[PDB]
Design an enzyme around this catalytic site. Structure first.
Site, short mmCIF file in Angstrom:
data_model
loop_
_atom_site.label_atom_id
_atom_site.label_comp_id
_atom_site.label_asym_id
_atom_site.label_seq_id
_atom_site.Cartn_x
_atom_site.Cartn_y
_atom_site.Cartn_z
N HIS A 338 0.85 -1.20 0.00
CA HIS A 338 0.00 0.00 0.00
C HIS A 338 0.88 1.24 0.00
CE1 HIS A 338 -3.66 -2.27 0.38
NE2 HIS A 338 -3.36 -2.76 1.58
N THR A 365 -11.14 6.97 4.08
CA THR A 365 -10.57 5.99 3.11
C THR A 365 -11.62 4.94 2.71
OG1 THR A 365 -9.70 4.60 4.80
CG2 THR A 365 -8.20 6.29 3.98
N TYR A 389 -18.98 -3.63 8.90
CA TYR A 389 -18.12 -3.31 7.73
C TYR A 389 -17.86 -1.79 7.65
CZ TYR A 389 -16.55 -2.59 2.97
OH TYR A 389 -15.86 -2.19 1.87
N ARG A 409 -11.46 -6.59 5.56
CA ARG A 409 -10.87 -7.95 5.63
C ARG A 409 -11.44 -8.64 6.88
NH1 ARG A 409 -5.18 -7.75 3.67
NH2 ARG A 409 -5.03 -5.84 2.44
N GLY A 425 -13.25 1.45 -4.89
CA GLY A 425 -13.27 2.92 -5.06
C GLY A 425 -13.76 3.30 -6.45
#
Ligand SMILES: N[C@@H](Cc1c[nH]c2ccccc12)C(=O)O
Length: 454
Positions: A338, A365, A389, A409, A425
């Site tokens: 990342h 994010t 989530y 995850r 995204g």
């Protein structure tokens, strides 16, 4: 005179993890926060002094025979009770020295912003859920030491008795011991694709720059959730992993992402944005990292999300105290790399834990820019409530420190099902089918962990 008392014991990480598994077997409610790859601390809460559950404007604090309840912002209700247990920081102990461990549902956001009520709440996930602990075991991976921590008032041989009982429990090898419902369907491919097109219309029209659109998959749970956690720890170890068990739901979290920490006045957030798969060769890795960092679209996405976090932390920081101390590092995780940045601020006097959460939650994010409009678009398009989530798992200290991850995850086990949620995204030039497939790929660690567990 309420204060924490702790005993530091040399100890091996694997001994700590094995002893946690053995002890937690007899506990209806327990939690582990595990640094499985990077991170300094792993935190075991076995025996809560209280359970805090908030849902739809009602909060219950279950503390022995007493169940306290009050209406309003569940975190404000929680904070007014929790403040009565506050302590001074002991600088010799770990960052977590006692307090509340649990989660903020994404839907805690409904107490921060004015949400429409459009998506279906079929899992009935609590808005907040905390186990509160006077007695904790904290593994320090850096000093290879187990901290056993209790709380006392005034009396100090009181402390020694309780610390002796914790030592007995953790340092004594434990014997060989033996080991339905109906919910809404996932976002269909056609449903998801039409939602991607709707997001692009909103972007074209200047409403938003980027939206995380997500899909919730489910399988029958055929094995004990802790087995899935142990598999996920092998498949994809991360710095912000968690296992939380209650009779009604278990959480298997493989998050690599920090939402926010507070140590004294120091606030930090660690936005992750931009991704590549690790290489075969660990030299391929240099060139893939080098490709990621020279990629102008990933940099643009990353800078946008760093600006969003600077503004979020800025809401509770002293003017001019917000700095990016680490800008656009590559960090290699277990199977991906990342782009990551570190954003710091100094907490302005008079802002508390609730103010900090209101400023930063949910993370930029995993929603988009701008955040408030992005959450309105998510709520209009996604068929089901996010629940856990893109919420946050972590802790509130009695000493007013805190540390929360972002839930990605992650498997949520309830009603005989394992629920796995992942998103993509969406941007101006997103292909519906690309973003659909990208959300399934993000779910690989979790479907893999499930399959291996049988
Ligand atoms: N990685 C954190 C502790 C941690 C592990 N898992 C977590 C999950 C949520 C919050 C914090 C954590 C540390 O060393 O400081």
């Amino acid at each position: 005179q309420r204060r924490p008392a702790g005993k530091k014991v040399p100890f091996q990480k694997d001994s700590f993890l094995k002893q946690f598994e053995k002890l937690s077997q007899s506990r209806k409610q327990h939690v582990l926060l595990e640094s499985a790859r990077g991170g300094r601390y792993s935190i075991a809460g076995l025996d809560p002094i209280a359970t805090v559950k908030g849902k739809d404007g009602i909060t219950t604090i279950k503390h022995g025979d007493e169940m306290l309840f009050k209406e309003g912002d569940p975190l404000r209700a929680f904070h007014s009770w929790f403040k009565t247990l506050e302590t001074e920081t002991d600088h010799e102990l770990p960052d977590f020295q006692g307090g509340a461990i649990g989660f903020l549902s994404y839907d805690y956001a409904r107490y921060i912003e004015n949400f429409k009520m459009l998506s279906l709440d079929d899992l009935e996930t609590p808005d907040i859920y905390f186990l509160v602990f006077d007695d904790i075991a904290v593994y320090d991976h850096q000093e290879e030491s187990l901290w056993l921590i209790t709380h006392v008032n005034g009396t100090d041989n009181s402390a020694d008795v309780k610390l002796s009982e914790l030592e007995r429990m953790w340092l004594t090898e434990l014997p060989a011991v033996p080991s339905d419902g109906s919910f809404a369907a996932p976002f269909t491919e056609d449903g998801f694709s039409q939602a991607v097109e709707k997001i692009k219309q909103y972007i074209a029209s200047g409403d938003v720059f980027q939206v995380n659109l997500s899909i919730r998959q489910s399988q029958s749970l055929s094995v004990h959730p802790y087995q899935i956690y142990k598999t996920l720890r092998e498949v994809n170890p991360s710095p912000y992993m968690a296992y939380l068990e209650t009779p009604d739901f278990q959480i298997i979290c493989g998050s690599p992402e920090l939402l926010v920490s507070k140590k004294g006045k120091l606030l930090e957030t660690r936005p992750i944005a931009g991704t590549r798969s690790r290489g075969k060769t660990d030299e391929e890795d240099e060139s893939l990292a080098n490709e990621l960092i020279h990629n102008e679209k990933e940099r643009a996405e990353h800078v946008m999300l760093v600006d969003l976090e600077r503004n979020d932390l800025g809401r509770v920081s002293r003017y001019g105290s917000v700095r990016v101390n680490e800008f656009m590092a590559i960090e290699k995780y277990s199977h991906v790399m990342h782009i990551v940045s570190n954003v710091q601020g100094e907490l302005q006097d008079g802002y508390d834990a609730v103010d900090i959460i209101h400023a930063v939650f949910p993370g930029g994010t995993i929603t988009g820019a701008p955040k408030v409009r992005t959450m309105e678009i998510i709520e209009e398009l996604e068929p089901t409530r996010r629940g856990l989530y893109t919420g946050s798992i972590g802790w509130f200290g009695y000493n007013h420190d805190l540390q929360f991850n972002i839930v990605i995850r992650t498997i949520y086990a309830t009603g005989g099902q394992a629920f796995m949620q992942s998103g993509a995204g969406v941007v101006i030039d997103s292909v519906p089918k690309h973003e659909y497939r990208e959300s399934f790929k993000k779910a690989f660690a979790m479907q893999k962990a499930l399959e291996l567990s049988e």
